[PDB]
Amino acid sequence: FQASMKHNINDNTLEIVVGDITKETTNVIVNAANGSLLGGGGVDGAIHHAAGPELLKACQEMRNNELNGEELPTGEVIITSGFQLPSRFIIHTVGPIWNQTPDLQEELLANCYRNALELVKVKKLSSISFPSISTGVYGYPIHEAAAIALQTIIQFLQENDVGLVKVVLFSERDYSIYQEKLKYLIEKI
Ligand SMILES: [Cl-]
């Protein structure tokens, strides 16, 4: 069993679900990466394993070329192919590390979502899946991160035509928090 809920915001749809993000057939899936775009554990690890080795080579080519060796800055995004993933593209983003930059970190986390959704708009794609950014080894508390993710996504969908946005969570616990936070946020609209 895998729980799910949805809500329509104008002609967009927001869905939260339990599942494996690497099995999503949306146009885009989002990877919670590190600035170096090197393979790690967690969701990033699952994404590299499902994508195949062409994903790491593609990411390192982009780092050495369009980024000129620089780290992907916190909140910013890049896009690659999906390779062996069932999506067309992967948008890589870097979430804030909890309490590294206290008065900026809420804004930075929000930037991940905003910059990803803006890229979907530009490329004229119509479906995107997000995992829970920064709530792995980066330690952002899930209750706070969930509120920022949902507030930012709902805000964007209220103001733009995108299509379908999914938040795909491997954890039933993370799901349970998102469900109550989304329900809360919906009541306030
Ligand atoms: Cl700061």
Numbering used by the authors: -3 to 185
From the article:
Three crystal structures of monomeric OiMacroD wild-type (WT) complexed with MES, ADPr or ADP were obtained at 1.9, 1.77 and 1.75 Å resolution, respectively. The presence of these water molecules represents a constant, previously undescribed element in the macrodomain binding site of Bacteria, Archaea and Eukarya, even in the absence of ligands.
Macrodomains are ubiquitous and evolutionarily conserved modules (approx. 130–190 residues) that recognize ADPr derivatives in their free form or linked to proteins, including ADPr, PAR, ADP-ribose-1″phosphate and O-acetyl-ADPr (OAADPr). A yield of 40 mg of pure protein per litre of culture after a simple two-step purification process was obtained. Its phylogenetic analysis revealed that, among the six different classes previously described for macrodomains, OiMacroD is included in the MacroD-type clade, together with other previously characterized MacroD-like macrodomains, such as hMacroD1 and hMacroD2.
